[PDB]
Write a protein that binds this ligand. Structure first.
Ligand SMILES: [Zn+2]
Ligand SMILES: [Zn+2]
Length: 71
């Protein structure tokens, strides 16, 4: 069925910047706090632990870990 939908609806076709490493966001992830960061910088950065860097909005484990191992 329908499984796997990410923020596609975009006014342009480019990659935004990051507010954690200060460089092109390799993986722009729309956080529940209305922000964008590298899927890696959010999953676990050097100075980050399951929490935004701009607003520090607690991120739910489900955010990254969604759905059972096997579908
Ligand atoms: Zn980053
Ligand atoms: Zn935030």
């Amino acid at each position: 069925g329908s499984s796997g939908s990410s923020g596609n609806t975009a006014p342009s076709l480019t990659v935004p910047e990051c507010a954690i490493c200060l460089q092109t966001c390799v993986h722009p992830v729309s956080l529940p706090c209305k922000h964008v960061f590298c899927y890696l910088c959010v999953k676990g950065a050097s100075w980050l632990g399951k929490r935004c860097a701009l607003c520090r909005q607690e991120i739910p484990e489900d955010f990254l870990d969604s759905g059972p191992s096997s579908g």
